[PDB]
Swiss-Prot record, chain A:
Belongs to the flagella basal body rod proteins family. The basal body constitutes a major portion of the flagellar organelle and consists of five rings (E,L,P,S, and M) mounted on a central rod. The rod consists of about 26 subunits of FlgG in the distal portion, and FlgB, FlgC and FlgF are thought to build up the proximal portion of the rod with about 6 subunits each. Coiled coil: none annotated. This is Flagellar basal-body rod protein FlgF. It comes from Salmonella typhimurium (strain LT2 / SGSC1412 / ATCC 700720). It is found in: Bacterial flagellum basal body. It comes from the Bacteria.
Swiss-Prot record, chain B:
It comes from Salmonella typhimurium (strain LT2 / SGSC1412 / ATCC 700720). GO terms for cellular component: bacterial-type flagellum; bacterial-type flagellum basal body, distal rod. PROSITE patterns: FLAGELLA_BB_ROD (PS00588). The keyword Transferase does not apply. GO terms for biological process: bacterial-type flagellum-dependent swarming motility. This is Flagellar basal-body rod protein FlgG. Coiled coil: none annotated. Its main location: other. The gene is flgG.
Curated annotation (Swiss-Prot), chain C:
One of its GO terms (cellular component) is bacterial-type flagellum basal body, distal rod. It is found in: Bacterial flagellum basal body. Its main location: other. This is Flagellar basal-body rod protein FlgG. The gene is flgG. One of its GO terms (biological process) is bacterial-type flagellum-dependent swarming motility.
């Protein structure tokens, strides 16, 4: 199930009991605009930045 | 309904506004001092789906990601304030302008408008009015026994009294300049009013401080290029043609989806 | 079933194709607009591992729209007969300053002057570097080298008033469009090169002309015919799968 | 069953939208008509409780309003000395036969048998303006002062002032047909002003303001409405067939 979700705190969760990647659970900033790679790398843009 | 149909609707509306502007230009040939108007367009939102940056691999970059975009929102109409082609009317009350500058006129409500139209008239009380009694600024009152009027290149308006062997000077006719002629807001009657965009008005006699010169016996024609308007009209009709074609295509797509 | 969803992916691909075509066709007569094209890309392939074998069997699923690339070619010119307006020969953009302070890039020439004389672009955005026209300017002259000057009443010489610099990009395809005929810099575009027009790979400037959009309408109409037929084909696939499943669940 | 009712609410919303579109397209070529637009709204939401902390299923859609677009219509020239159109905001005030007052942005005026200025249906304009019995020419200036010209008397006798009325909320007015609006509690009291001052518009004599209906908008809207109707009917048919297969067992 790749239906990933972002919580208000920024904790990536396929349905709660969150997702694990390169260590423990992954966390992203609150301003997600997340894009996920062709090989998993997760990049984020704060929605009002260059 | 479909992302396609809203986009095509915006395109049709843009072509319709463009045709409105062309029709207003084409109708206002042979109107003195009219300024050709032209619409400047502007594309709407772009729904970003994949960020054009956003490195895909640990090394790659994903150039030029997926973004769709909508709409053709018309953003402005610029007015071309170029000198019209003067015409020899040989009329003693018709005065044209060569260069920047606008006649100032007192609206009956007490506010001042600006007109590039010297098709003047003299009413009961002797005032110079302009096709509607709009009394100019500053007031110029012809004496009731004056015979012939003249308006020098410098705006000095003087009349020939009866019996008096001299052109006594009656009034002074000055122009006004705006540091953005285009930003004036037209209110009809061949009149413009000051807005925030035009900026403060600088009133001065003709010639001095950037204003033009005044030519009696001439009238300024509309700077509407007939061939330009005609080719614009052909091009607009074909663009409308094509956008309605896109609307119909989306309709066929949707209908085939329905009978599914 | 699998057929139903891969046909849905095909339908979505054709629909995004039509969206691009419609935005293209509507944005004709938009100055400096650059035609866009959608590039598609097939999704995962299922491998059915066999129990030699000159070709394995792979079922494959659907299709995904992978990109939209903007054709940054040179558009035809239009004689606006307006002193303010300017057009670009070759590569380059006019940098503009947004209200927030970040710089955008527009390859549009419909300039104006506001009450403060700043050369602004139909929407109030101040071009960069700033050019301030003096109060009673009789004319504006913009050479092909970009330097802009005015002629004052009483003076027999053009008092030079500014320099209109262009900006070139490594990959101007990769710029992100933010509407309003504006683009902004991205990771994929590289740093801008702020250069004098006519030099260092920048284009030249034409006064009194505006660049028309490079949208080829005949190509768009033929593409619309393709899109309609392809959508109807994929809808046929969806319907056939629906009939198949009807007969399956009947038994 | 559930989907059946929610899809029926969808069908009803699309039918209301088509009714509005038909009324717009039909009242084209009505002087002073303001095109109407239907604003829809979704109904209440059922919350399934999870033992995020729940999910919402939702039910249908509801037409919540119709706003009238009180823009300025194109003028049309009619060569009629009584017809008047309005530049900008404002409404003519008329007196209904019962005694109350309605407001019309329609200036196809006439004079009845007693010289009173009435409005194509016989409602007296306000204030009472009565043309003299032997009028040659009637002039209505931009400031609303209506005057006539008598025989040989080389001076226009002022015969009335044709005021306008402006509202705090143009859209709040309810229309009672016959190109008439009457004040509602959502509109606020009328502000009776002379034309051209205090926000009211000017008057153009010999011109009638046309409807501000955009027919290209309405044809595209009809495309959307027909496709949406067919789509919701498709959903209804789907639910119906599911109920087939449910009751077969």
């Amino acid at each position: 199930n790749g239906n990933i979700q972002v919580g208000p705190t920024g904790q990536l969760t396929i349905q709660g009991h969150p997702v694990i990647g390169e260590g423990g659970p992954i966390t992203v900033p609150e301003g997600s605009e997340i894009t996920i790679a062709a090989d998993g790398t997760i990049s984020a843009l704060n929605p009002g930045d260059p | 309904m479909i992302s396609s149909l809203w986009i095509a609707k915006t395109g049709l509306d843009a072509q319709q506004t463009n045709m409105d502007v062309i029709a207003n230009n084409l109708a206002n040939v042979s109107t003195n001092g009219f300024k050709r108007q032209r619409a400047v367009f502007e594309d709407l939102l772009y729904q970003t789906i994949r960020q054009p940056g956003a490195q895909s691999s640990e090394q790659t970059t994903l150039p030029s990601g997926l973004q769709i975009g909508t709409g053709v929102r018309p953003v402005a109409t610029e007015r071309l304030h170029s000198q019209g082609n003067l015409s020899q009317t040989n009329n003693s009350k018709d005065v044209a302008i060569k260069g920047q500058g606008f006649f100032q006129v007192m609206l009956p409500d007490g506010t001042s408008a600006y007109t590039r139209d010297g098709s003047f008239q003299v009413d009961q009380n002797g005032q110079l009015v302009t096709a509607g009694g709009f009394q100019v600024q500053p007031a110029i009152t012809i004496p009731a026994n004056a015979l012939s009027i003249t308006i020098g290149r410098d705006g000095v308006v003087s009349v020939t009294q009866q019996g008096q062997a001299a052109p006594v000077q009656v009034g002074q006719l000055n122009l006004t300049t705006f540091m953005n002629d285009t930003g004036l807001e037209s209110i009809g009657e061949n009149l413009y009013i000051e807005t925030q965009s035009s900026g403060a008005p600088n009133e001065s006699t003709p010639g001095l401080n950037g204003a033009g010169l005044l030519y009696q016996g001439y009238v300024e024609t509309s700077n509407v290029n007939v061939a330009e308007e005609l080719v614009n009209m052909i091009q607009v009709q074909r663009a409308y043609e094509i956008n309605s074609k896109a609307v119909s295509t989306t309709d066929q797509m949707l209908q085939k989806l329905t009978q599914l």
